[PDB]
């Protein structure tokens, strides 16, 4: 079967993890974010948010000097473990939306980066003195959800978080991109071309040039999943899954791009027999839009697995 994958972290008002960990139709949950980059942020630690979680608390460094890292995500910490029982792949984002002044300053930046987040967020190792941000907790991989300022060091981040995944080879960890739907992608494109990643969800909303909106009416621009297709055969990212990647409600991104459930059916119908081996399934933003959305008493993302499933 494909697969349906939806981020977590940033809705208001947002329900708990855990709350996702127990719905069914779920097979990857993208934790966003960690929103604030060495190169630029406090302490020059990797900083994070997750909208109302955690109780506020951050980390300091060695040196007493005030991190963006959250130290009391308490009940995320809880909650990861309960989502992996239930066979869910839980990744850690890394970008979103705000601040939009984040990027990576040099190759070595870009190592340093994936280093820190590995020991902080991956397999507990003796040798590390540094954050466990949810604890002995380890997450499945991470998510490059860069949304601004070009795509500079994410091809060296991953290339570093593969080799750290080979060094571990009786677990599997995974790497996943959320371009926008326009090629080139001026975040994500230089990262695919040089870097392997498992999972890529195209962004099917707020660009009319190419939106999923456009599969359904083709006068506003033109649906380019076979572009995407034919743009990894030349990429390090070959062997990537292709998600199509959608709003989980009218007002979860930009006016116009929501599609209801028979709408994406017709695309996903048609894409998933066009492209049997390529084709991994949905991503939704987000958690909480879909939650809010219920129909005929479900909400959104369960709608969603219907259709990969049927
Ligand atoms: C993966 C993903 O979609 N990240 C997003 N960040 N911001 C979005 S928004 N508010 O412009 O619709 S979506």
Redesign the pocket.
């Known amino acids: 079967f494909s697969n349906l994958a939806i ?1 977590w972290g940033q809705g208001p008002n947002q329900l708990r993890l855990s709350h996702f960990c127990q719905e069914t139709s779920l097979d990857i949950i993208n934790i ?1 974010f960690i929103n604030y980059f060495p190169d630029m942020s406090p302490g020059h630690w990797p900083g994070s948010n997750f909208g109302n979680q955690c109780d506020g608390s951050v980390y300091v460094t060695n040196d007493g000097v005030v991190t963006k890292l959250l130290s009391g995500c308490h009940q995320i910490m809880e909650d990861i473990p309960i989502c992996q029982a239930a066979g869910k792949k839980v990744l850690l984002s890394i970008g ?2 705000y601040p939009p002044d984040q990027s990576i300053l040099s190759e070595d930046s870009a190592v340093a980066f994936a280093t820190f987040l590995w020991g902080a967020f991956g397999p507990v190792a003796e040798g590390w003195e540094g954050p466990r941000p949810f604890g002995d907790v380890v997450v499945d991989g991470f998510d490059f ?1 860069i ?1 601004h300022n070009g795509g500079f060091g994410y091809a060296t981040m991953v290339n570093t978080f593969r080799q750290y995944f080979n060094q571990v080879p009786e677990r599997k960890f995974y790497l996943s991109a ?1 371009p926008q739907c326009i090629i080139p992608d001026a975040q994500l494109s230089d990262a695919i071309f040089n870097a392997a990643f498992d999972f890529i ?1 195209i ?1 099917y ?2 660009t009319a040039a190419c939106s999923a909106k456009s599969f359904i009416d083709t006068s506003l621009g033109t649906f380019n999943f076979d572009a995407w297709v034919t743009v990894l055969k030349a990429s390090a990212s070959k062997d990537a899954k292709l998600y199509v ?1 959608l ?1 989980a409600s009218e007002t ?3 006016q116009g791009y929501y599609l209801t459930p028979d709408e994406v059916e017709s695309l996903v119908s048609t894409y998933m027999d066009r492209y049997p081996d390529t084709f991994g399934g949905i ?1 939704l ?2 958690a909480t839009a879909s939650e809010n959305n219920q129909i005929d008493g479900a909400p959104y993302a369960d709608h969603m697995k219907d259709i990969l499933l049927h």
């Open positions: 981020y966003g979103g939306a959800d949304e959320a969800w962004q909303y707020n990647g709003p979860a991104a930009n991503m933003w987000e």
